[PDB]
Ligand SMILES: *[C@@H](CC(=O)OC)C(=O)N[C@@H]1CC[C@@]2(O)[C@H]3Cc4ccc(O)c5c4[C@@]2(CCN3CC2CC2)[C@H]1O5
């Protein structure tokens with residue numbers, strides 16, 4: 001029974017540090033207002049699940065040693081239910097984390113709208129409901145099975161037993177393993193696919209304008225669609241939809257496609273460059289610029305039009321003579337800046353530096369992405385052997401040796417060990433987290 | 443038997459366009475010297491497999507219609523063997539493609555060494571050997587099974603039959619589905635993790651120097667290790683290993699760790715900046731520069747040392763006065779340029795532009811990565827339903843309805859349809875490929 005006792009020891013470490021760590025994490029998330037972010041809401045869900053599983057650990061270890069389940073019927077139902085709930089909610093939360101990461105990175109303008117932590121709370125609730133769809137019947141079908149001279153807290157079914165058992169094994173195998181992993185993989189691939197640094201004007205302006213496929217009132221309150229493409233001053237939707245129909249050639253109903261937006265984009269960019277070329281105030285300043293600053297100029301022409309950018313005589317003067325800090329200061333004193341300060345700040349920085357540093361993303365995204373990725377990898381390493389082992393046993397017979405039981409309980413074990421591994425990871429891969437940890441320690 | 447006839451029609455389309463397409467692809471790869479790249483070698487392997495499966499298609503359709511296998515014993519063995527070989531070699535090739543992509547992107551300096559197409563050919567061979575480990579016994583255990591009034595080309599086993607059958611199902615399920623998908627996922631995650639554009643000096647210099655963890659003779663023929671960190675002029679390894687031991691503090695034996703290289707890196711970068719600061723010729727030119735050009739200066743000090751970069755009076759003059767094209771031209775006429783032209787070209791471009799455009803990667807990488815990613819996604823969409831369906835049937839009983847057989851043969855069908863889907867994809871996601879296609883068409 002050395003296996004049983006080593007299981008007890010290992011499980012004691014996992015239980016103590018697991019509970020301690022997850023309680024610490026949840027408490028920290030709840031307590032500080034700085035710690036309340038979408039990522040941290042998801043992390044909270046994860047920590048909750050882990051805390052529950054670890055809570056059920058000590059009852060299992062004494063089951064190992066006694067050879068019986070003393071704790072009754074209801075507590076058993078609770079235990080198994082918590083087991084399944086953990087298995088589901090964990091990987092589902094990892095999924096929502098991968099999706100949220102993908103959104104935060106590949107769709108920043110859209111990200112700022114719905115990446116509020118309340119949405120993370122909502123999707124966490126939905127996670128728990130979907131998981132309730134499997135967890136509740138498991139809680140119902142769990143009971144105490146009496147045997148010759150022992151007691152079991154197994155999940156039992158009516159005849160044919162192997163049927164319902166293996167059916168459950170299928171459902172968990174598809175929904176709690178295959179599908180979520182596939183979703184994560186798609187998120188990652190799509191992420192590599194849609195992530196690329198900004199070195200040109202087209203990328204630059206999309207950061208400034210965004211991809212909105214429906215007609216929306218802009219900052220100035222005018223009906224707009226695509227990437228910053230303006231339609232009409234009038235408030236009526238038809239005069240905007242008919243202009244959209246005119247710009248496209250087919251009846252839009254107020255909705256276009258990505259290719260139609262990209263096509264609408266390129267013509268506006270060239271129309272801006274064209275407009276510059278026919279302007280005797282702009283065209284000279286145009287050729288005096290490096291590509292980065294030339295892009296900044298097109299950005300202004302894109303926004304307010306050629307006639308408006310024409311009346312920037314002194315800023316244009318300073319630009320043509322290459323007086324950068326002078327021009328930047330003068331540009332910051334315009335009504336343009338007063339209207340759209342953040343965008344103007346980026347463009348002015350582009351004029352001043354000749355570098356793209358006003359656009360390139362913060363390192364926070366990279367750090368959090370790294371964190372989530374590593375967490376996911378650890379989870380996969382911990383849960384893959386058991387998910388596979390179960391399916392294997394379900395459909396073939398294994399030559400009973402001590403090695404079989406050792407490997408089996410080892411897989412179950414590490415499957416539980418993930419739960420105590422998690423908070424330790426939060427410390428290393430997150431600076432605010434290790435900061436909170438230090439605040440609790442020092 | 444409408445199912446059988448529609449299967450025949452569908453399979454005729456898949457067979458004709460599949461064979462045509464894959465033969466076309468393979469021929470194009472073989473014929474042109476421009477088409478011989480690592481990516482295209484992998485693609486060749488894929489096309490080969492697909493061509494084989496499609497080759498086995500027509501024999502199956504007549505099996506559907508006749509209700510018997512007329513084609514004998516050997517041809518049957520061939521068919522099933524080809525089936526399994528396709529299933530394995532395809533996804534293995536996708537794996538090697540994801541790995542090669544990851545290498546090409548995240549380790550360019552290392553990439554240029556072993557991304558020769560001969561290595562792709564070698565790994566293709568190994569792919570076929572690993573796949574031979576499962577394909578050969580399948581070819582042996584395949585035979586003609588006679589029944590009441592029909593004939594089967596099934597794979598049959600001795601008693602217990604379900605045991606060996608389900609065992610095979612397990613092995614294919616782990617090795618031809620789970621594990622490869624996991625490997626791909628790890629490649630993608632690691633890719634996002636190690637991919638980031640260049641905006642600072644540390645990234646810049648790593649591009650120029652590379653991460654080599656063993657002591658190697660550099661371009662100048664001196665013993666070097668880490669990121670461009672020099673050791674000794676002497677040819678003896680000990681005097682280099684002892685210097686490495688001295689630089690680290692523990693006995694290295696000529697091998698360090700990534701953290702030790704990164705630490706060795708930061709001190710050299712600052713030592714360069716320090717050296718500049720104590721130089722009355724360099725320090726003035728230092729403060730006159732924007733961050734990008736300041737990085738270029740550190741790059742030179744890193745390479746040839748403070749004393750060498752001191753004797754660039756005229757280039758330094760032109761730099762301080764901000765005469766960029768002048769300085770760039772003058773720098774290109776140095777013995778520095780004559781020695782290491784490619785690196786010097788990048789640094790000079792950095793001095794001339796103030797932008798990082800000499801470092802940012804080619805769009806070819808992005809395009810090919812996109813291609814491979816999309817191919818992989820399509821494959822997953824095509825092979826997932828059947829891989830799952832098989833496991834399901836292996837361990838539970840399905841209520842026999844027409845819907846069951848329809849869905850089943852539909853899954854098998856699309857599983858075969860991937861093979862004809864592939865070459866069409868090569869046309870869209872690759873410009874050289876659609877160019878070859880046009881050369882064959884127009
Ligand atoms: C059925 C056959 C059997 O031997 O039951 C004793 C079976 O293996 N059910 C598993 C046992 C392991 C399990 O309690 C674990 C691991 C896991 C993975 C997959 C899956 O289908 C099943 C399981 C569980 C339920 C979930 N817990 C999760 C904790 C990490 C260990 C049963 O269902």
Ligand SMILES: *[C@@H](CC(=O)OC)C(=O)N[C@@H]1CC[C@@]2(O)[C@H]3Cc4ccc(O)c5c4[C@@]2(CCN3CC2CC2)[C@H]1O5
Nearest residue numbers: 525526529610611614615828829832835854855857858
């Ligand atoms: C065993 C039970 C059965 O009903 O045999 C008739 C079984 O399902 N074996 C599968 C049938 C399908 C199969 O011929 C296909 C698909 C596939 C996927 C998984 C896997 O384990 C097995 C298979 C094959 C062998 C591979 N081909 C690949 C072609 C794309 C269709 C058998 O083994």
Ligand SMILES: CC(C)CCC[C@@H](C)[C@H]1CC[C@H]2[C@@H]3CC=C4C[C@@H](O)CC[C@]4(C)[C@H]3CC[C@]12C
Nearest residue numbers: 381384385388389392398399403404407408616
């Ligand atoms: C790190 C991850 C990806 C690896 C996946 C682990 C899986 C594939 C490995 C790890 C441990 C392995 C099991 C260890 C013990 C046994 C008992 C033996 O009599 C039959 C094989 C069997 C059932 C193995 C099946 C495959 C197995 C479950």
Ligand SMILES: CC(C)CCC[C@@H](C)[C@H]1CC[C@H]2[C@@H]3CC=C4C[C@@H](O)CC[C@]4(C)[C@H]3CC[C@]12C
Nearest residue numbers: 174823826827830831834840841845846849850
């Ligand atoms: C696109 C990919 C990721 C989706 C995965 C497809 C899988 C999960 C789906 C697609 C078709 C589905 C099968 C369709 C037909 C049947 C017969 C039915 O009596 C039992 C369910 C069963 C066996 C389904 C099992 C699940 C199934 C195999």
Ligand SMILES: CCCCCCCC/C=C\CCCCCCCCOC(=O)[C@H](O)CO
Nearest residue numbers: 029030041044045048120121122124125128
């Ligand atoms: C059996 C388990 C069932 C789990 C069901 C889902 C619960 C988990 C969902 C979201 C986690 C909550 C994070 C903290 C915000 C709410 C508490 C702190 O409150 C706040 O600060 C808000 O502003 C107002 O509530």
Ligand SMILES: CCCCCCCC/C=C\CCCCCCCCOC(=O)[C@H](O)CO
Nearest residue numbers: 471472483486487490562563564566567570
């Ligand atoms: C039953 C299938 C067994 C498959 C075994 C592995 C074969 C596939 C491996 C590599 C693909 C070859 C690509 C073309 C290069 C060799 C032919 C063209 O030759 C060349 O041009 C070379 O320079 C010299 O050979």
Ligand SMILES: [Cl-]
Nearest residue numbers: 197360361639
């Ligand atoms: Cl960036």
Ligand SMILES: [Cl-]
Nearest residue numbers: 197639802803
């Ligand atoms: Cl780049």
